[PDB]
């Protein structure tokens with residue numbers, strides 16, 4: 001059986017750059033996928049989207065829209081010390097958190113900083 005780490009590696013292998021908002025979305029998809037025993041269907045949807053000719057980015061988004069655990073779901077909260085703990089390539093994708101952010105609308109996660117600051121990662 002494919003592990004969360006295996007899936008993360010598979011997905012990373014298709015992404016350009018590193019530490020981009022899409023890599024973080026891979027992280028979220030794998031975490032929530034593991035927690036809901038849905039890694040297989042997520043991998044199947046990913047591969048099927050690639051096989052149809054979708055970009056890998058679009059494949060990840062498609063997973064957020066097609067796998068029910070992400071449908072109308074709030075973004076996960078991820079506790080960090082500071083903004084420096086966020087990958088450089090994610091920095092310009094950080095935004096104030098709106099009311100009711102949703103993963104399937106592009107809100108990948110919410111970072112909670114130690115001093116109380118919160119930043120949403122938007123795709």
Ligand SMILES: O=C(C1=C(O)C(=O)N(c2ccc(Cl)c(C(=O)O)c2)[C@H]1c1cc(Br)cs1)c1ccccc1
Pocket residue numbers: 004024027028030031032034076077078079080085086087109
């Ligand atoms: O995305 C991050 C994750 C890890 O360091 C890590 O081990 N992550 C991770 C990914 C997949 C799994 Cl399956 C797990 C796990 O089971 O603990 C953890 C990342 C997380 C995703 C979510 Br949602 C909460 S934590 C992260 C990124 C920047 C700063 C801190 C954490």
